[PDB]
Scaffold this active site. Structure first.
Site, short mmCIF file in Angstrom:
data_model
loop_
_atom_site.label_atom_id
_atom_site.label_comp_id
_atom_site.label_asym_id
_atom_site.label_seq_id
_atom_site.Cartn_x
_atom_site.Cartn_y
_atom_site.Cartn_z
N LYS A 1 0.81 -1.19 0.00
CA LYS A 1 0.00 0.00 0.00
C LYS A 1 0.87 1.28 0.00
O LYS A 1 0.42 2.26 -0.37
CB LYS A 1 -0.92 0.07 1.28
CG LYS A 1 -2.16 -0.88 1.34
CD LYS A 1 -2.88 -0.68 2.67
CE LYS A 1 -4.11 -1.54 2.65
NZ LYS A 1 -3.74 -2.94 2.54
N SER B 1 2.13 -9.49 -1.13
CA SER B 1 1.72 -8.13 -0.98
C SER B 1 2.14 -7.47 0.41
O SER B 1 2.23 -6.21 0.47
CB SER B 1 0.21 -8.01 -1.19
OG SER B 1 -0.53 -8.95 -0.34
N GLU C 1 -9.66 6.03 4.97
CA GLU C 1 -10.49 5.00 5.65
C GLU C 1 -9.60 3.76 5.84
O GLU C 1 -8.64 3.58 5.06
CB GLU C 1 -11.71 4.62 4.71
CG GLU C 1 -11.48 3.55 3.52
CD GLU C 1 -10.56 4.06 2.41
OE1 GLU C 1 -10.31 5.33 2.33
OE2 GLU C 1 -10.02 3.20 1.64
C1 LIG Z 1 -4.54 -4.06 2.25
C2 LIG Z 1 -3.84 -5.34 1.73
C3 LIG Z 1 -4.45 -6.13 0.76
C4 LIG Z 1 -5.91 -5.88 0.20
O1 LIG Z 1 -6.22 -4.73 -0.46
P1 LIG Z 1 -5.89 -4.78 -1.98
O2 LIG Z 1 -6.33 -3.55 -2.52
O3 LIG Z 1 -6.95 -5.78 -2.30
O4 LIG Z 1 -4.51 -5.14 -2.47
C5 LIG Z 1 -3.75 -7.22 0.36
N1 LIG Z 1 -2.52 -7.55 0.91
C6 LIG Z 1 -2.03 -6.76 1.91
C7 LIG Z 1 -0.71 -7.06 2.52
C8 LIG Z 1 -2.71 -5.67 2.32
O5 LIG Z 1 -2.15 -4.87 3.23
#
Ligand SMILES: *Cc1c(COP(=O)(O)O)cnc(C)c1O
Ligand SMILES: O=C(O)CNC(=O)Cc1c[nH]c2ccccc12
Ligand SMILES: O=C(O)CNC(=O)Cc1c[nH]c2ccccc12
Ligand SMILES: *Cc1c(COP(=O)(O)O)cnc(C)c1O
Ligand code: NA
Ligand code: NA
Lengths: 393, 261, 393, 261
Positions: free
Chosen positions: C86, C376, C108
């Site tokens: 993010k 992610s 948010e």
């Molecule tokens: C916030 C997050 C997501 C989910 O939000 P996306 O917009 O769907 O990518 C996925 N993986 C991690 C590590 C997150 O912090």
């Protein structure tokens, strides 16, 4: 006989029981071999890069220094896999254990970070790892204890003596001295019997090489000073080494001053301790007057090593490095200040080093200076202790 | 003094091997410690081996780690151990007395002054567990200058270079280690040690029954040392001091008897 | 009028009350401007690189795949500052707010990570940040709540409706619609009213560009598939975008299946929900049959967004991407497996994507395939929930 | 039907401005809601504005968010609201009835079918809070096909392009917003709206006292709408239903009286 000098002036050596020397000679030999081996180097370079994330950024903090004539850069070891600089040397030590044909790893840990680090290197590289940790620290580091175990390591608590890191460090030795033939002892700092202070240094030195390159790239010249916290010495020697021959470059090591030097309750044996022989080496030790080893105190669990690497005591004695201390409050102020003006939560450990930079800046704001602080780790793990303190207060 | 040389010669005229128990000074308390020691002697020890409680005894197993803790629970300090030594030498003239030290306690207030204090209480030898021959110079020197014999450990895997260093640098007796690990096939070392005129070997680590004392002597060692087993006895009897001395007595007699022709 | 298409086929648009349109038109305009501005790009590139740590490694996991004919690489967004992907888009959105001359940021957050992320971008870049978070999530995300506040943000709990992320998302809008002139709304996923799905995509796309380069460098050719979890869509669109025109490259999105699709208690509206109009857009929504919005369920707090980005629904409808689901158990197994065989604690979110790769491998172990999973985020934050589950079990 | 056109013409022959209160259907319960509504009428409302409880009313302030929650605490659903509407139309022939909807509830089971169900219960208008003119096509179409007037909000900063879209696309009345923000200098819009033959404007958001109704009419608006204030009254009186209707009565009368010549 050794191949390299086990001494930095008067400090260092190899004070282990006779049964362990063939192990340290073998280790030294295998390390000397490795350093001239291009395959070993290429394999080390490849994990540091594609597994651990190197190189780490160098980050200019304009918000911190505004209104002054300091420029401050932080070397972002907090970004390294694992979250602290320790992952560098563990990967190197693991490839060494490999190269010796050992299959098991033994490590000691206080605050948990070297234990997490040896367990991750172990898992990656196919070694069976057991970690010793003092029951007091076990109690107070469950996250860590559970992380190491998710990573397949076995965690063995130590109940003898003060039940903390030094008592883990004894239990590590005892075990090594009966299993050295299959196990390698992944010591966690640039300390202990040779060749460990030299090998930990050389496997952490990329921190200073990359710093130098980056600072030459961004500023056109070397820093006036590099600053780093000093728990047992690995991150600081890592940041210092490559600048040692650059005489105009300040090396400042920061030991925890705890509640205050005058109070006694500190972690600063290099400047406020007394030379002793322990843990395989001769160096400043926290000790009573009769010579029993005592614990280091600090608001940050990882500057707990009750002694300091030999090479730092040497550097200090010849004038080439400077060592200072920073108290818990000072380190908490620096923690806060980074969170709020650059949006990096630094480890309380690295908080000490930032804190001394901030003093350098604040006490003489019109001095022209370019500082680098080694941000040795991230402070996610410290969020609650800072929380509880700021609540009581 | 030459108490070791004297004992060895005497034992050799009896065709006897030497039996030397180890304890930690002040475990479980000073008074009881002094009584243990006298009982060890009265039961037949040829020489003592005594540890000074230290905080971080990285070459010992649990057994002796508990011994240091019990000694620390009772406040025992090095200056107290030396007073202990002094009254031990006062009570027994000729018994060789060796210390088992960790480096820091000998280097603490100056190496030379540690060996000098050893000489004034009548100690005969000192073994420093975490100082290998490679680092022994300052310690062996200071030792010979005050007439104390510096003891060294000859490991089972010792190579010829080491054998010679031990034989050259040690005095009084040579600590022949039976195994790697911490406190808890020697014929070659032993012959080679005689070959290099080492001090007489005492076999150590894991000796806990009389058969092993006999086996050591047969192997050519001048004797054996037992500590863990001795400490076990202490630790087992803490609730009854009298039973403590009695079992110490019986075990030591049994050990000593086994070294006899 | 807009400058770009607000629709991906039938999904997307700009369904906000009339009072907010001038704000979305202004935002779109400023973003179009920025994308052609070299200064803006150079400034974005410089924070991503020297502040956030880009590029992130691409990590080959030989231990995971041994004995099979899969080769698996993970793109290490867990190594990015902040710990998850993010941070990329927040820095971009902040420079945008700057470029518009706004001085305040509104965001948010559910599980806390977008709130931590907007607060760190804010602190760095001189903005005043307030974050809305549903009281249920506040309760259960104290670390995060305290992190954002150490970083100077103000955290405002939301007690209305289910008190979770969607109720935070409403409270964000309400506020934007009375302060848009000074504040910018840093929406947290590639969702919501245009131009947000497009701008979040373009500020996350470096994840796929770097993946492509790295994989060409290490393997000589593009992956057979790229896989990514899908909470609201930002990380996955980020990994996908640059491969979209590469037809031979599989795009697989993984939505949380929770206790099980048949049970109802899931988070997979793209494949198991129903088209609706909410949160500024038309897309699959978790909803009752009468049309009230419901919550998404998952063992991982961050796949809580009860809807999904429009561009994913489009990609799915034309066949160009595939979407599947993975349950909590499956995701916990994958978590464990990574910790123990590569020594990376992945986020439970990214655990879902790894889990589907492992299925691809396991179900057909002699198939020849080169997979990339987008890791992610890191799973440090999940250590205790995995702990409590493995204890009850 | 042409109830709005009819009311407007009648009011214009009286030199009167229109006063229209808003409530959420089913808040605090159905029966009480039906009584509130009848009381609003009996006290003088010219037209009603009724919300269908929705889970995520992102354009409303707290006041009306509590109203939806109370309605949800009582189980109220859209199908129930429509039955409510139906019996309201049955009781009062000529009063214009507008709904305030969120997009999802209209798009849910097909847009066209939502406007058809509106026509069969006798609804006259529908305002959809989160569908801007830019996205209004499907909604305005479906509306005109079933004879419902699609309402649009004209924001205070509306530029001429928007003014014209609103005047072209809306019917029945034009919702003139007094301010940005959520539920809680118009002369120009109002003239421009007349200029483009918009439907008559009702001024909305923040009207809570009689002075403002009078001020709106003077400004040229055909009337004002008040909801928050009406809901406040409900929420204040939940413990006493009878006092609820009585204060509703007094406030509405006061509001209506103020729109009078
Ligand atoms: C916030 C997050 C997501 C989910 O939000 P996306 O917009 O769907 O990518 C996925 N993986 C991690 C590590 C997150 O912090
Ligand atoms: O416990 C034993 O059986 C024998 N111990 C000794 O001979 C005394 C001893 C205590 N710690 C040591 C470390 C090295 C060598 C001997 C010892
Ligand atoms: O609360 C008010 O004062 C006025 N409200 C209305 O006219 C009804 C309303 C409820 N939510 C809305 C959203 C947009 C426009 C009108 C409304
Ligand atoms: C372990 C650690 C230290 C202290 O050990 P050193 O060897 O002294 O570097 C410092 N900073 C961090 C983040 C640590 O994890
Ligand atoms: Na230290
Ligand atoms: Na979703």
């Amino acid at each position: 006989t050794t191949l390299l000098n086990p001494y930095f002036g008067e400090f260092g050596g190899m004070y282990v029981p006779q049964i362990l020397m063939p192990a340290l000679n073998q280790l030294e030999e295998a390390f000397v071999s490795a350093q001239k081996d291009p395959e070993f180097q290429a394999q080390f370079a490849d994990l540091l890069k594609n597994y651990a994330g190197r190189p780490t950024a160098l980050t200019k903090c304009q918000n911190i220094t505004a209104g002054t004539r300091t420029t401050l850069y932080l070397k972002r070891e907090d970004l390294l896999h694992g979250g602290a600089h320790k992952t560098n040397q563990v990967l190197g030590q693991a490839l060494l254990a490999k190269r010796m044909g050992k299959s098991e790893i033994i490590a000691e840990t206080g605050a948990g970070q070297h234990g997490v680090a040896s367990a991750l290197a172990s898992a990656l590289l196919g070694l069976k790892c057991r970690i010793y940790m003092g029951a007091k620290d076990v109690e107070r580091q469950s996250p860590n204890v559970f992380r190491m175990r998710l990573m397949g390591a076995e965690v063995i608590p130590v109940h003898s003596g003060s039940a903390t890191l030094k008592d883990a460090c004894n239990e590590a030795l005892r075990d090594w001295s009966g299993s050295y033939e299959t196990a390698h002892y992944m010591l966690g700092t640039a300390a202990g019997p040779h060749p460990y202070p030299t090998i930990v240094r050389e496997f952490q030195r990329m921190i200073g090489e990359e710093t130098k390159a980056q600072i030459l790239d961004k500023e056109g010249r070397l820093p006036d000073a590099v600053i780093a916290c000093v728990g047992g010495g690995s991150n600081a020697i890592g940041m210092f080494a490559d600048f040692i021959n650059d005489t105009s470059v300040g090396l400042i090591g920061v030991e925890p001053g705890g509640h205050g030097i005058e109070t006694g309750e500190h972690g600063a044996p290099l400047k406020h301790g007394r030379v002793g022989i322990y843990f395989g080496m001769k160096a400043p030790m926290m000790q009573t007057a009769d010579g029993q080893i005592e614990e280091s105190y600090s608001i940050s669990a990882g500057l707990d090593f009750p002694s300091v690497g030999p090479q730092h005591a040497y550097l200090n004695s010849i004038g080439r490095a400077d060592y200072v201390s920073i108290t818990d409050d000072e380190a908490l102020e620096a923690f806060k200040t980074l969170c709020r003006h650059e949006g990096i939560i630094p480890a309380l450990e690295s908080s000490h080093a930032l804190a001394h930079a901030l003093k350098m800046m604040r006490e003489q704001p019109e001095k022209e200076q370019l500082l680098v602080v080694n941000l040795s780790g991230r402070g996610d793990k410290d969020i609650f202790t800072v929380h509880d303190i700021l609540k009581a207060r | 003094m030459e108490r070791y040389e004297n004992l060895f010669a005497q034992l050799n005229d009896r065709r006897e091997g030497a039996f030397v128990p180890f304890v930690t000074l002040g475990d479980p308390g000073i008074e009881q410690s002094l009584k243990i020691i006298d009982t060890l002697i009265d039961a037949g020890a040829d020489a003592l081996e005594l540890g000074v409680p230290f905080s971080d005894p990285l070459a010992d197993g649990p057994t002796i780690q508990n011994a240091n803790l019990r000694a620390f629970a009772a406040g025992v300090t090095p200056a107290q151990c030396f007073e202990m030594l002094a009254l031990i030498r006062e009570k027994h003239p000729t018994i060789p007395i060796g210390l088992l030290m960790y480096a820091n306690l000998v280097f603490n207030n100056g190496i030379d002054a540690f060996y000098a204090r050893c000489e004034q209480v009548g100690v005969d030898s000192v073994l420093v567990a975490d100082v290998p021959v490679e680092e022994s110079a300052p310690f062996r020197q200071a030792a010979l200058r005050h007439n104390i014999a510096p003891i060294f450990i000859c490991p089972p895997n010792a190579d010829d270079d080491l054998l010679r260093q031990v034989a050259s640098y040690g005095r009084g007796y040579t600590y022949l280690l039976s195994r790697s690990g911490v406190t808890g096939p020697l014929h070659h070392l032993i012959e080679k040690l005689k070959e290099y005129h080492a001090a007489p070997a005492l076999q150590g680590f894991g000796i806990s029954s009389p058969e092993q004392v006999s086996a050591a002597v047969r192997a050519g060692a001048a004797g054996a040392i037992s500590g863990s087993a001795i400490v076990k006895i202490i630790e087992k009897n803490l609730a009854s001091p009298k039973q403590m001395l009695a079992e110490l007595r019986s075990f030591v007699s049994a050990m000593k008897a086994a070294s006899r022709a």
